[PDB]
Structure 1
Amino acid sequence: MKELIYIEEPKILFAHGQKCTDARDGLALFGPLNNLYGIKSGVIGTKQGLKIFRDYLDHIQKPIYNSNSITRPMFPGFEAVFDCKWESTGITFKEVTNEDIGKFLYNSSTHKRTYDLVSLFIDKIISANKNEDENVDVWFVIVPDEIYKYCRQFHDQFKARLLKHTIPTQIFRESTLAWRDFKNAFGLPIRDFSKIEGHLAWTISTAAFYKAGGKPWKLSDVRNGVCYLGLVYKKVEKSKNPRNACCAAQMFLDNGDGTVFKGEVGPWYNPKNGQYHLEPKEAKALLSQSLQSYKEQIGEYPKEVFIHAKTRFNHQEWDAFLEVTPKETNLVGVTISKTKPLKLYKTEGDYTILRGNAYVVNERSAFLWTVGYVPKIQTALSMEVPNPLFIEINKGEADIKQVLKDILSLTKLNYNACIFADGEPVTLRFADKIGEILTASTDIKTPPLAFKYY
């Protein structure tokens, strides 16, 4: 016999201060935090890609429907949701001929074809950015199903080679926008969207609205004076050594008034393979940069720093963290894992365990079903029995209930997608994203620090 404590769902704040539990419903009912006047779109690709993007942009102007409007709310239309014009008349096309694609695609090397294709694409984008009169907010790179299939490497290099110029860009596949006609040789559409189409529109519109300077929502219930750091480790395959560990961090504070989420980055390196620990110099540098980033924006030091991670810190780096911080800030460190397969079955045999259940092992460990059953949409976030996150307070002193509440809150602010909630806190996921991008090209000085470039 064991006990399960329940943690309630947090609220995400929409326009005119209206709390809600779902992003889709809150946006379809209240609207985003800030209003853009419109989205000016630059399109890179062939003529067929331009036509496909034009027709899809016209298509998402009208309301779209899902099969069952409880599991997935319908899409009213882009303007009805975001109060912004994103039309096919603002398209600034830059034609790319098919022979151009072929004359680098049809080589024998694997890295060189990706290098050349990304080079041509980014050179066209940079030329259009430097010496054209028009102002383009987001560049929509439509690719055919003949590059990404044989370029895996394309996406990471593409995003890494635009970092010094800071052009927000979104990559699309011609099958994603033209799934209806892009079937196989048998005629079966390999990317059936007929029953999800509205959710596809939701995710695409939210990503586009985010990359153009719009804030779709935020967190309403979070305490001031606290900051969170999601630290992830990545392997540099192209370095001198076959593996070279690199630490990348994503920062989340509240703000002087609300919702700052930037990410202090610049990969801190560890040469020895298999050691996912930061050397004392690296730890001091990372913590100092994070503290300055918080302080220069707020004016005062935080009252609590909450270094999330996927691994366990050792004594050297935690001591180093303790040296570079003043005597008021309380420092905690929590390691989140997924290697404990506690698949809590249900006795009714109809649906999975409710999302928000925690088995508190002791005062310094717990489980959390961040992915489970959410009743508002009558379905679970998974298909099989979900695996819970095993949250342990590796270092410091803190309340495990507050830890679980904060992780559940952090499971909401995912702007790359419009879903009910994520499975892992967004600090870890976004730090993983930008650390994966930053290591694509090992020549980068002072990265932008903003997620819309990644």
Structure 2
Amino acid sequence: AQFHDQLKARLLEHTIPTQILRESTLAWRDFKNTFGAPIRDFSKIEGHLAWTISTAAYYKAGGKPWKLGPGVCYLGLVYKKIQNACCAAQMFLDNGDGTVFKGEVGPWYNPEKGEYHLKPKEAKALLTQALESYKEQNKSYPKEVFIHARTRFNDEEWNAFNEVTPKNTNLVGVTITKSKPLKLYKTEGAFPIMRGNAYIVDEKKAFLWTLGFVPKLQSTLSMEVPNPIFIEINKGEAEIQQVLKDILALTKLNYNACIYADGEPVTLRFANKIGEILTASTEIKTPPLAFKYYI
């Protein structure tokens, strides 16, 4: 069950970009269900398959496939069960316009069994790490810190964030929840709601369709009917429209894949990946912090 996670974790100390390729992926035709078609039917997706692998092989080899199109750091933190461990993923833009997307690691441990929140000291440590990373990569403090997570930020941990953040810097905390039971259909066509439509329930909470029918792709990124993601501005001041625009922008940086877009923002996904990688094995001091060693 934990082969990939353990292998990626044990390679973290001696930095080695590794890609695990299953035999059932590379040469799927040979392995057959013993009564018919191969156990994995990749015939419809071969090029796409190659696409992803090539991009992954181009990413871990130190190549940057695509950028994004300032002064704002988007930080997605995700809690993994082990005690719980919070792991972050940061992305921003520097003076060179080459988007920096590495992700903050060194998971912060909350001893509580089910409190998916950070103690004040851990929150201050995480925010200091992220802010100092921004300062080192941009020689100046960011204009805004855009925290988003799959959990709602409590008053205590957000207050700790506010104490530890510097002046003239606005920080926003967003609860991005998936699998919200709002199946919005289409009554005239036979095809689902197109990707990008948003249902603003309130000035701070809304539904976003980061996935669905795409005109350019001439089909849907999701089978059946798309499930919108609930974007709620839980803390801080921010326009809901700008927040949804930022979330749609984040849904483009999935270097782990060659796909038009993914249902959830990339920062949360990569924070989840590095969190699984870390929690696979024993503690690692100053983890590499670059995605090619986890993804």
TM-score tier after normalising by the smaller chain length: over 0.9
* Equivalent-residue separation in structure 1 for 2:283 and 2:174 (angstroms): 32
Decide which of 146, 153, 175 is 1:306's aligned counterpart: 146
Match of 2:27 in 1: 178
Q: Deviations 1:19-53 (Å, cap 9, x if unpaired)? A: xxxxxxxxxxxxxxxxxxxxxxxxxxxxxxxxxxx
1:401 and 2:241 are equivalent in the alignment:
yes
Q: Which amino acid aligns with 1:267?
A: P
Match of 2:61 in 1: 212
Larger Rg: 1
Q: Which amino acid aligns with 2:232?
A: E
Q: Deviations 1:271-293 (Å, cap 9, x if unpaired)? A: 11010110000001000111101
Q: Which amino acid aligns with 1:427?
A: T
Aligned with 1:247: secondary structure? Answer: strand
Aligned with 2:43: secondary structure? Answer: coil
* Equivalent-residue separation in structure 2 for 1:393 and 1:177 (angstroms): 42
Aligned with 2:280: secondary structure? Answer: coil
Question: Does structure 1 retain, via aligned residues, the 8 Å contact 2:179–2:228?
Answer: no
Decide which of 89, 108, 115 is 1:250's aligned counterpart: 89
Decide which of 197, 200, 203 is 2:49's aligned counterpart: 200
1:230 and 2:76 are equivalent in the alignment:
yes
Match of 2:106 in 1: 266
What is the identity percentage for the equivalent residue pairs of Structure 1 and Structure 2? 80
Q: Following superposition of structure 1 onto structure 2, how do residues 28-67 of structure 1 map, counting pairs within 5 Å?
A: none
* Equivalent-residue separation in structure 2 for 1:450 and 1:203 (angstroms): 19
Count of matched residue pairs: 293
* Equivalent-residue separation in structure 1 for 2:190 and 2:258 (angstroms): 27
Decide which of 341, 346, 367 is 2:186's aligned counterpart: 346
* Equivalent-residue separation in structure 1 for 2:60 and 2:104 (angstroms): 19
Deviation at 1:349, TM superposition (A): 4.5
Match of 2:221 in 1: 381
Deviation at 1:339, TM superposition (A): 4.6
1:428 and 2:268 are equivalent in the alignment:
yes
1:363 and 2:212 are equivalent in the alignment:
no
Match of 1:320 in 2: 160
* Equivalent-residue separation in structure 1 for 2:168 and 2:62 (angstroms): 35
Q: Deviations 1:283-326 (Å, cap 9, x if unpaired)? A: 01000111101001111100000001011111111111111122
Q: Taking structure 1 as reference, are residues 192 and 226 closer, same or farther at Cα in structure 2, changes over 3 Å only? A: same
Aligned with 2:231: secondary structure? Answer: strand
Match of 2:13 in 1: 164
User: Which of 1 and 2 has higher RCO (CA within 8 Å, sep 6+)?
Assistant: 2
Aligned with 2:255: secondary structure? Answer: coil
Aligned with 1:377: secondary structure? Answer: coil
TM-score normalised by length of structure 1: 0.64
Aligned with 1:394: secondary structure? Answer: strand
Aligned with 2:44: secondary structure? Answer: coil
Superposition misfits of 4+ residues, deviation over 2 angstroms: none
Question: Does structure 1 retain, via aligned residues, the 8 Å contact 2:75–2:90?
Answer: yes
Q: Which amino acid aligns with 2:87?
A: A
Question: Does structure 1 retain, via aligned residues, the 8 Å contact 2:175–2:234?
Answer: yes
Q: Which runs of 5+ in 1 are unaligned?
A: 1-151, 237-243
Deviation at 1:172, TM superposition (A): 1.2
Q: Which amino acid aligns with 1:247?
A: C
* Equivalent-residue separation in structure 2 for 1:395 and 1:232 (angstroms): 17
Q: Which runs of 5+ in 2 are unaligned?
A: none
